[PDB]
Amino acid sequence: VDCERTCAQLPPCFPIKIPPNDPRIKNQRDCIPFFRSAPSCPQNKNRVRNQINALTSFVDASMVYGSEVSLSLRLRNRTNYLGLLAINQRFQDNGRALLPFDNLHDDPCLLTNRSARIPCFLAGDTRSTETPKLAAMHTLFMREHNRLATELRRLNPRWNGDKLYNEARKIMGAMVQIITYRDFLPLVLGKARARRTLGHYRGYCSNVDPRVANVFTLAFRFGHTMLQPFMFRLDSQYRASAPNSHVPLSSAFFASWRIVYEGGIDPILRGLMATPAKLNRQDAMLVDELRDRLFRQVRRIGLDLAALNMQRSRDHGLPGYNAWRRFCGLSQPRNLAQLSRVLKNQDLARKFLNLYGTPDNIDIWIGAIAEPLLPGARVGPLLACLFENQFRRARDGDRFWWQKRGVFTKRQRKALSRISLSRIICDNTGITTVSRDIFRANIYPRGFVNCSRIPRLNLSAWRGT
């Protein structure tokens, strides 16, 4: 049945019920819709249910290229042999490329501004327009692929279209791995902690299982606590001068029309560099733009992302908080006194026990994001353990890890080591002043430099290879 149009507990639904004291939803028979995740290999019925991962577990830029062959070809520009990704044929952003449009039945982007009639963008992953901030990243990386294939053609005029696409794709996968492991993970975990728990790369291990685990798909939603209530857009002087510079997120979900008609991706990229993230605090976890107004412009009711995350771990048959603490070699608090020490917060521990009775039953996302943050990190110990486990596997179990001997040449690894997300912005946008340490909060003009000061990717090591 259509879980958006009934609150009955009929297949494949698992509706989120409304409490009597709800501060927002006052219809006691309403629900927040919820479709269960599809089961893997549905033929066997007496087996324990598992959920599917539709994407490649490797950090390989599959969100740009696709994880299915037919989709990966659909994203390519098939009108020439330049090895490019297809671009929007109707709109451009100050002369620069935009993503092609998708062709969805009941396209949600069309519902965000009925008169603009701008559908969702098409990229390697189905969620590319969940915000215009995420669509801006997808657009930026599609441009970087085309810039790489264009420069590789200049160096290698006899390479065919497939070789140009394959080589640009291989460089892009390495850049995504470098930005992730060198820049992002040390700031999630703490720099010393990332060095100690991930360690230096020692080579490929064919006995490592690189698959993404079911629990990681819930734990890595810790990011939801870092959203501010607005999408921030800034002009070329990094000022919120336009009259709609602070867009509430609940009017920006799926709003591809904002990229097409409200200034392209540069104001969005500038907003991301120059605005601080929200800090996860135990008494300020998730903004109401996500906890109460999620997707309100495209669904019959504003959803609650925290409720979806907790219902989703139940849907996915995940063990509770203490089972995951035990998996990580952490203590299993059994009562109020112990939970108060683990959370460094008696009032929060009391609220958890009033709701759950035992910490054994706390749903993984809420218990994990409630842990106090480790010094230098944006995670407590449980999320640090789970993320270290997943990212260690994704690196050590990947036969195409960028540092593995034979994947790239020594000269190519040296050239790749100079890349940065700031350089990708400089190379593919009209922005000429960027933050150098892009993931740190930089209050403009502090930490911002001209693009000429940011190292470049020298592609000479790809000539004649």
Add this chain to the structure above:
Amino acid sequence: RCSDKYRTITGRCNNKRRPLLGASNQALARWLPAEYEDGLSLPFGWTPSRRRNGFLLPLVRAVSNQIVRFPNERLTSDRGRALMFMQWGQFIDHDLDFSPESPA
């Protein structure tokens, strides 16, 4: 024969002895055994009266209302991280995993 120069699109052939490891369209790995109300597929919370470890489960929306919800005066910006840090996290999450929903 798996290639030694380029990745496949689907991730197949990254592990030569177990070619589907890490490939798309497969079951998510489990780091611990699954826990369902009936031991097979019904989620905990499916039957309101079915206890987990001897206790009734709260409504996920009640947990959200009582613990997650907060007023504007407590919103705190992170002095050490830009929104670009958050955005890289969503973007890399979309390189790693997506569980499709069951259709209507």
